[PDB]
């Protein structure tokens, strides 16, 4: 409905750094981490390789706590 989530804009290789190219913001089902929190997610690392169009959960994210 309204809520747009975090969804990697290209193949992100298990344990990169997150870049701004790396994440768009669309409204997905279900509901990963906010699309608001993209700023803060820059240089933290994904605990495993995240296809193109995968919504980013905060379980991928290491070290991610909201």
């Known amino acids: 409905a309204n809520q ?3 969804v990697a804009n290209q193949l992100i290789p298990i344990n990169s750094a ?4 790396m994440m768009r913001s669309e409204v997905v089902t279900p509901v990963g981490i ?4 993209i700023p803060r997610l820059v ?3 994904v605990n495993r390789a995240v296809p193109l169009g995968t919504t ?3 379980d991928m ?3 991610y706590a909201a």
């Open 61 to 63: 994210v290491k070290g």
């Open 4 to 6: 747009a989530s975090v």
């Open 43 to 45: 240089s933290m690392q």
């Open 56 to 58: 980013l959960m905060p």
């Open 18 to 21: 997150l870049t701004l190219v």
């Open 34 to 37: 906010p699309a608001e929190d």
